[model samples]
Target: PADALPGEGAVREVLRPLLKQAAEKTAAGKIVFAEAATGTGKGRMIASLAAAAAIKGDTVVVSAPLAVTWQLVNDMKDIPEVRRVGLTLSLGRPNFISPQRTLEWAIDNERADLAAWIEGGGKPLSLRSMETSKVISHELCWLLEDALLLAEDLPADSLLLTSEDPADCPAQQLYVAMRSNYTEAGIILCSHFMLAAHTRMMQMRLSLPHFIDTLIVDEAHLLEQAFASVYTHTLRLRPLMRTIEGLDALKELFTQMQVATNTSLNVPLSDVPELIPALKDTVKTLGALPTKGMSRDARSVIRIATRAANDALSGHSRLRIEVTPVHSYPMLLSGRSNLQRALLGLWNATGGATLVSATLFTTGDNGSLTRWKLEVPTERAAFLPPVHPAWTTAPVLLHKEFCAHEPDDSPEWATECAQTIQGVASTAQGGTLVLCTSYQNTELLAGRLGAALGDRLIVQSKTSSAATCLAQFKAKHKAGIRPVWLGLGAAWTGIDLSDHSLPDNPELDRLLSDLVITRIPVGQNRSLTHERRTAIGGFRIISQEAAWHFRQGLGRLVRRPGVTHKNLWVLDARIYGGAAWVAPFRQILDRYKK
Candidate 1:
C-alpha cells in the first residue's frame, strides 16, 4: 500500500526495499540500519511505511531530532495516503509552544523582567517548542484520542496568540493531552528526545506510549551525536552552583509543598545527606581548578569533583554524570555508560528502527569515538548504498589558502577569517549562513561581517529569540532583502533552509545556497580538563564528531536534488595544514568521496 509518489520514482525505487526490510526485519524484531542521502525523500518513505504499518489500532512511531520532526510531518502532508489511513500526527510536547504568539510576545513585551527572571533562576525558553507549536497549531492539529478523533481545522489567523492565551487554547489542550497517548495513536510524530523521554517516564508510570510497533529515525547519521547529547550532562560552575542552591533550598521547597497540601510534615536530609556536602565539594574543587594546567591532570580534578557528585546522587536512579571540559567556563560535561542505558532502553522497546541518513555512516571505521556503550540487543542490518543520490550535486569544498597561526588564537587569524568571509559573500551573493565554532568568534565575526555588510548580517545571540530571528531572516530572504545569516548553535545543522517558514515559496529552495565555514569545529582545547577525549576508548573522537558536524553544515546547502548548487568556503588554514588532530576530519570527507 505504501508506494512512490509522482516524480519521486528514483527515490521510491531505492527506499522501497529499505522500507520493506524495516517492516520485515522489525516484524522479526531486529533493528535495521538504512542510509539515504539527504534530499532523497527519506521523509516520504518513512511516511509511506508509517501509513502502511499504522493500521486500525496499530501505530508507527517516527522519531527524529527536533530539527527534522516537523519537516517529516510536512513531508507526510504531501502524501494523501497517510491522511486516508486516518494516521494523524502527534508531536512531542516541547514542539507544541508558540513563537510570535507566546514566547516572542514575552520577549518583546517583558524583555527586562524575562531577563531578570532567567538570571534569577527561572527556567529558560526553548525556541523549537515556540516555533513548531505555532506552526502545528496554526496548521491542522490532528486529534488522537483512545482511537482516531477528527477535528475541524482551525483558521490560521483566527486564534488570539499570547502566552496566557495559548495555554487556554482548546487546540493546545488537545495537543498537550495527546502527548501521552502515542501508543494508542495510529501515527505519532516526535523527536528522539520524546522517544528517549517516554521510556524513563513510563518506567516511573508517569507517561504512556508503552508500546511502539515500529520506529524510524530520519537523518539517522545524526543519531550518534543526538543520542549522546541526550545522555550528556553539563555541570557548569554557574549552573552547577544554581542546582546546588536549589538543593540547598530543598528544605524550603518541601515546607512550601507541605503548606500547599495543608499538612505538617518533617523532611529529613538522611536520604540525601550528601547533597549539600557533595555540592559544596564540587564548588570548592571548581574554584580550585586551575584555569590552565596539564589537560589530563586538570581533567582529573574535574573527574574527582564529578565522582563525588555522582556518588552523592547514586541513590537516585535516573541521573548519570560524566565530565568533559568545554571553553564556556568551570564546566565538565559529557556522558558514558549511564546515558547508553537510557538510550538502549528505548531502542530495545521498539519492534525495530531503520536508521536512515546519507551522512550517517562514517568513513572507514567507527574512528576513535566511543560515543556510547549501549549493548544493543536487536540484530543489526546495515544498508549502505555505495552512491549517494546527491553525490553529484554535493557542494564544492575549497580549502583556505593559508592556515591559522600557531596557537590557533591570534589577531592575524581573526582578520584573515573576517576577510575571507567578506570575500566569499561579495562573489557568491544570495543568502548565506556562516558557521562559527566558538561563541567569542561568533561575536567577533558577526561584528566584522556586520560592519562590512551592514544590515545584511543576521547574528543569533542571547538577546533575541531564535524563532523570531529565524522568521525575520527567512522573511528578509524571501522579500529579496538578501543577508548573510550569522549564527551559531542551531545554525549549523538544526535549521531547514528549504523550509518556507512563511507561505510556500519555490525560491526558498535556492535561498542561502552559500556556506562559509569560519573554521573547522575542533572544539575547545582543554587538554588538561578534557579527559573524555580518550576516556571512552575512542581515538580523536572529538575531532571525528566535529568533522561529522562540519559535514552536516556543508550538506545544508543542497537540501534537494538539482534544485540548487552552493559553494562551501573554508577560512581556517589549519584544515589543510594536516595536523594529526585534523586528519580524522579530512578522512571523513575523503572516505565519503570515495
Candidate 2:
C-alpha cells in the first residue's frame, strides 16, 4: 500500500538488515544504539521505522538536537510512508512568540507603538535588526526580555493566545494547530531539549500530556549533553546574598562544605549532609524575600538558589552541589546528573527507544562513552557498515611541518596553519571548510587568509548567526567564487554542504571539497562537565571525545549522494605525534590516509 523504500539497489540492500534489527530490538522494549556513516540515508531509515511502528498502531516521537531538528522534519516529510502515518512537528517554547506576554509587557510599559505592532499582527524583530535599529525604544528591548522570561515560565503545552480570537496572533494560531495536531498525529517531531523537558515536566505531574510508543533520538551522541543542559542548575552567590537578608549562616555553611569537600569544584550533595538544614532554612528565608524593585536577574538567582536548596534537602542522590567561580564571582552549581533513570523510564513506558548517530562510536571504545553516560548496556548497541563505499577512500592529510609542542596561538603555528590551508584549498576544485577549535583561532586564521582569499573568505563571527554565514558562503560559491568558510562550535556537526541541493549544477558537484581541522576537537579544559567525565573515565575520555569529533569533522566531506573524493587536512601536529593520547585520532585517520 505504501510506496517502496526511498533508497535504491545497494543502498537499500545495505539498510535493510540494520532497519530490521533496529525495529525488532525496539519492538521488544529495549534501547538500541545504531551507528551508521554520514549521508547514509539515516533520516530515511528512521522514517521507515516510524512508518512501520505507526502502521502497527503505535505512537512515535522523533527527537533530535536543535541543530538538525528541522532538517529531520523535512527528511521525514519527503517520505510518503511517513506522511501517510500522520507527522506532527512540535517546537520548543522559545521558537514561538508569546502573544499574551508581548501584549502584557507592552501594556504595562505603556508603549503604544509596540502594542499597535503586536495588535496588527507584526512579526517580532530579528536580533540583528533590533541591535541596528536607531529608532528602537527601551520598551521595545524589554519586549524581547519579557518574551524570553515567559518562554522559560510557560509550560510546553500552553496555547499562549493574545485574545479569544486566534486570528489576532499568527504565532498563537500556529501554537494551537501544533497542539491539536500533536494530540492526533501518529508520529511527532521535537527537539531533544523539548523531549527531555516534557518528560521531566510529566514526571513532575505537569503538562505535556502524551504517550509515546517508540522514541527515536537522532544524533544520540549528543543526548547526554542536551539532557545535561536541561537539568543543570546554577545559583549565583553574590546576587542572592545581596538580595536576601539573614543569609550569614547559609554563606558560612557553603564555605564550610567547600572546605569539607577538599575545595573541589564539583561535590555530591550526599557528602555534605550537615549543610542541608542550613540550606533548608535559607530556602525559607528566600521564599519570604520581598519582590518589589528587584531586578529580573536577582529574582532568577534567588529562584535557582531556592530550587537547589530544596533539591539538596530532599536528598536527590544524583544532585551534585558545586561551588565554583564564574567570571570571577562565586556561584553554587547543582543538579548536574545524567538522565539514566529518566531515559530508562521512557524506554519502559514507551516500549523502547532508538539512539542513532553517524559519529556515535569512538575508536576502540565502540559505544562505551554513550552507554556510560546514558546508562545503557553493551548488549543493546549495533554498528552498521557504510552505506556508500566511495567515502571509504577519501583522502586524509596530516600536516607534520608544524611543531607538536607549539601553542595554537603561537605566531609560528598560526602562519604555518594558514599556509597549509592555502595549499590544500588551492588543490581543491570546490569550496573549503576550515574548522577551528576556538573563536580565537578562527579569527586568527581568517585574518591570515583574508587578503589572499579576498571575497572568497567567509568567517563565522559573533555578529552573525551560523545560518546566515552558511547561506552567504553557499551564495558566493554558487556565483563561482569558491568561498572558504572558517567556523567553530556549531560547525563541528549537523551542517551540510553537499551538491545534493544543487542537482542541476555539475560544476558544483561538491560544495565542500576540502575539510581542515585546526586541532583535535577536544572538550574545553575549564568545563565542569568535561571534568566530571574525565573523573569518570580519565584521559581516555578526552581521547574518546576527540575521536568522536574528528569523525564528525570528517563526515562533513561525504554527506549524501556521495562526493567522489575530498581532502581532509588535520593541521594539528599533536594528532600525528607519537603520544598515547593521540592514538585514537591516528587510528581514525589511518583508514582514510593516502
Candidate 3:
C-alpha cells in the first residue's frame, strides 16, 4: 500500500533522498527530526517513511497540528502498504469517521488472536456507529467515545479506554473489560489537553505501560507551553477583556436568537450538554490558555465566569445558550497528572520519543530578548529548498499576523502594490491569486489592485469555500485569466495552489499551520474599542486565527509550479515581528531574501 507508491510524482523527485534517509533513521529506532517544505512533496515522504516504520514492527503514530495535514495523512491510507499497517485515529463523539482507532462490532465467535489485543473483545471492524458501549470511567468514556463511540449501544465483548484520567468516580466495568481482554490495547494520539491527565493517571497506578504509554508528541516544540497551558490554568488581562466582550454580546445574541427559527436555535439542551460533561471528564473544551496568572486562581476565575454563564442560561426559557466547546477545558482544570506521568512512562520505555515541530529548532527575539527552541519534526525543513529557493521574488511576506483589517498602504507601499500589478500584468494570461488576512482584507486588497487592473478573475473569501475557491482558481487558470483570486481565512491552511492553501485550520488558539513554534503563540491584537474591533473577520479574533484568512492571498499566486512562476507579497504591518514566535517568520523571510 505505502511502498508501492511513496509519492505522486515522477520516479525520483527532490524529496526522495530525504525520505529514504528518514526511513533509514526510523528503522534504526532513533526518533527523528526531518524537515520538508510545504509543496515539496512532504505528504508522500511521510506516507513512505511511516510505512517503513510500520513494517519494522514499530507502530507509527502520526500527529499533526492541523486537521488538514492529518487529512492528507488519512488520504494516504488507502494505499496498499498503509492499509496493511492498520491505522487508527482519535474519534469525535458525534462524527464517526475512522480518524483514529474507532469503535467496533462485538462477535462472540471471533478468533482468539484477533480479539487478543483489542479493547472490545469483539472483531475489529472500525466502528462507524456502536450498537452499545461500556467502560464508564470519565477518561475511558472520553477515550471510548473518541473516534469510536457513536453507536446506539456497544456489544458485551467491547471495552473502552482513553488517554484521560479517572475523576472522583472511577468506573470498574471498563477495567473489567480490559482485564477480560489481555489484548485490550489502544493508543491515545491525543491533543495537549490529554497529556496532563494521561501523565497523572500513570502516577496514580491506573495505567499500563504498553498501552498508549509510548507517549510521543508529534509537534514536540509546543510541549513545555502545552503542558503549562493545558495543565497550569491562568487568566490574562487583555483577552480576558475580550472574553468579557464576547460574553457581553451574549445577551444581545440570545435576545436576537430567541426570534430566529434556525435549527441552531431549536436544538434541545439535553442532546449537547453531554459535551460539557465530556469536557469535564477529559481535556476540557476551552479557548487559548491565559498568559497572565496562577493555575488555582485561573480555575477560580473560570468557575466564577462559568457559574454566572450557567445561571444566565438557566434564566433563559426560550433560548438555549450553546457555548462552543474547545478541546482543552478538562486538561486546564485537572492537570494531566495521569496523562503526563503516562507520557513520562512512555518516554522512559525502550524506544525513547519526544515531539517535534518546525519552530522548535529556531530561536529568536522577535520581541523579548529571549532564546526559545521549537522542536518541529524534520519534514518541514527538508522540503524548503525547492519551495524557498525557487521564489522569484525575495521577501515573500508571511503575513506574520493579522494587522489592521482595513489594510492601509502608504504611497511607498502603494508603489510596491503597483509593482505587484506590474508582476501579475507581465503575463496577461498568467493567473494570480491575491492573498489577504480576512474577507475584509481580501476585498480591500482586491479593490486596490482591481482599480489598476480591471476585469480580472477574482475569488472573494465571502463568495467561496476552500473547494469552491480552488475550483474557481483552477477554472481561471485553464481559461487564462490574469490575477484570478482574492483568498483569505481558512484559505491559508487548506491552500496548496502549485495551485491552493497549507495545513488546514488552526493559526489561532490551536496553533499555526505548517509553522509550529516553541515560544508562546503571538498574542491577538486588541483595539481600544468594540467599534474598532468589528471588521472583515471581526477584530475580536486572535491575530493567529486572522492569519487563517490569509490563505486566499497565497493560493492565488502559488499556481502550478515552474510553468507560470509564483510571487507572494504581504503588506501586513503585523508581519514585522509583533510577537515572539514571530521570530521564526523573520528567519523564513531571510531565506527568501537570500
Candidate 4:
C-alpha cells in the first residue's frame, strides 16, 4: 500500500477482458466490437473507458439505441470517483417534450380523456405536460456555417438538457468533458443517432472522440443492425393527427391546408398548417392503435399527404418543394424534404459524439452497408456486414409448433393452436413465447385456451405499456407460476427475461414465454404516397428494417444463458415459407436450434 493510493487491499495482475480490449482498440484509433452478454457489466466498462479517456484529454461519448437502455446508462450515473471527475448524462435532443402519437397518447387518453379535455376547452393551448414535442414542429433551424454564431462562448452546467429554443442549442454541457485535458470527464449522449450525428451537430471532425479513447457497446447483438440503420429512417404516418388532436392550433392549421387545397391550383402543397384537420380524425384513429398499426397507417397517410401537399403547393415560390416536407414527422416520402435541417439544429452544432442502440443501425445488403458512415470520422463510411456469430450457441429455445395457415372448412385454426399449446405444456412446464402473427388471433386462441386454463393463463396484449408489464412478467416468472405470456410487438425484441436455468431455483424455473409474434415482418410493397386507390407493383423496402427486427425479436428469447422455454412458436407461417428475408434465418435456425 502506498501513501498516495486510496484503497489497496490487494493489487491483482489479472486484467478485465473488456477494459483490456478497449485499451488496445483506443490506442490504435480502431473499431472494436465486443459481444458481451447481458449483465456482463458492459456499462461499467463503458464508464471506466470514458473515465480513462478523460485523463488523456479526450471525451468518451457513450450512447444506446433505445430510450430505456439510455436510461440504463443513467442507472450507473452516480459513480463515486467518476462523479468527482464530473460525469454527465443526458439525451442529445432535449427530452422530447411531447408524447408519441399512438400508444403513449392512448395511455394518456385512457389515463384521462384527451378528446373530451380538448372539447371542453375554449380556443386551445400550446404547451402542457408535453412528452416528446419540440418547439419547431413544421419548421426547421437554419444550418449556419459556424456554430458559434448562435452561442455565447461560455461553459454552463455540466449535465445540461437542451432547454428553451432548440434552434440555437449550444454548449449545453455536451462538451464539458472535452474541455479539460486531464480533468477528463464523460458525457453520456443516449441515442441511436447522436453518435452518428455528432460530427454534423458539433460541425467539426468527430474522429477525436474515438481516438481520445475507449468505447463499449451494450446489447452488442444489435450493433450490426444499428449501424445498418444509421442513415435509414423508420418513418410512420399518424402523428400529424395526434398533434392536431393534442393541440387545437394545429387543428386550425390543418383546416387552412384543406382550404388552401380547394383553391386554384388543384393539388396539395407543403401547406402543412391547412391540411392538419382533414386527416385529423383519421390520425386520431391510427394514433389510438398500437405502434405497429400506427406505423402502417402512418406510412400510408404520409405518402398520400406528401403527394397532395406537393401537388397543391407546386407554384408557390415561398414554399420550396425541395426543402419543405409536406407530411411532417420523419417525413421521408415528400420527394423534396429537409428533415436533416429540422433534426440537426443542435446535433449539427456538436461534431463529436457516440451512438448506442439495442438495434441502432438499419440493415441493407453486405457490400452496400460498408459504404455508409453512421458514426465518427466524417471520412468513415460503411454498410458493415453482420459477422453474425454462430448463433446456434445463442440461448434460444424452440417450442416447435407450426401456426395453422390453411383451413379446409372448420374453424379449426384457433382450436389447433390451443391443442398445440396444451400438448407442449404437457411436456415443458415454464414460461413460453407463443408468437402469433396477429393480436386478434392471439386473443382468440389465448381466450380459447384460458377458458380451459384459468389461473394458469395470463395474457399480455401487444399494446400494453411495457414499463408496467415487463417488470410484472419477470416477477411472475420468478415466483414459479408459469402463465402463458401472450403478445406480439416489443416482446419479440427488447424485452430480456432470463429463462434458461429454469426449475433450478424458484428464480430459474421460467422458460421462454412462448412468444407469439402476431404478424409476420413483411416488406412494404406499396409506395407510401397517399392515393385514393393507387397501387404500385414490383417494389419492396427489403423490410430493409424488418431484418433486424426479427433478429431483435429472436434475441428477446435468449436474454440470458441457461434459460429455456418449450420453444419459440411463430404463428406467422410466412417466416419459414414465404419471406426470402427469413430465408437465411431458417438455415441458421435449423443448424443451431434443437
Using lDDT, give the best candidate's number.
2
Displacement of the residue 149 alpha carbon in candidate 4, Å: 43
* Tens-digit per-residue lDDT, 265-368, candidate 3: 31324334333333232122223345355342234345534433342233221122332233211111111111233434434442523233322222221210
Q: Estimate TM-scores for all models.
A: 0.65, 0.72, 0.44, 0.53
Mind giving the per-residue lDDT tens digits that candidate 1 earns over 1-594? 344432233245656666666556655666655656666677777776666566423557777766566567666654555555443345543333332233233455555543343242222233433344443433333212100111122222222222233455544564566555443446666666666557656554423356677777776555544555554444444444443333334333223322222111112133343444555544455555454543421343355446544533443322222223333333333343335456566766776566666555455323113223223442454333323554434444443443355325556566667777777677665787777776677777776677788987787776644555677778877787666776676677667777555344434365765777777866533221133444554555566557667877776676655453556666666667757877765664463321
Worst 10 residues of 2 by lDDT: 132-141
Q: Candidate 2 regions off by >4 Å?
A: 1-13, 66-85, 100-182, 205-211, 236-264, 268-286, 289-332, 378-388, 392-409, 425-430, 439-472, 475-483, 499-501, 504-507, 524-530, 562-565
Question: Clashing pairs in model 1?
Answer: 220-356, 221-360, 294-528, 295-527, 295-528, 299-528, 368-538, 368-539, 403-573
Best candidate per TM-score, number? 2
Q: What range of 10 consecutive residues in model 3 has the weakest lDDT sum?
A: 509-518
> On residues 132-233, what C-alpha lDDT tens digit does candidate 4 reach at each position?
112111111111111112122212221123232233333222223222322334444345454444433344323224332444445544443333233233
**1 or 4, greater by TM-score:** 1
Tens digits of lDDT, candidate 2, 221-291: 77767666666666666767766642677777667556542344555653664566667777787778777
Best-to-worst order by TM-score is: 2, 1, 4, 3
Error of 4 at 305 (Å): 18
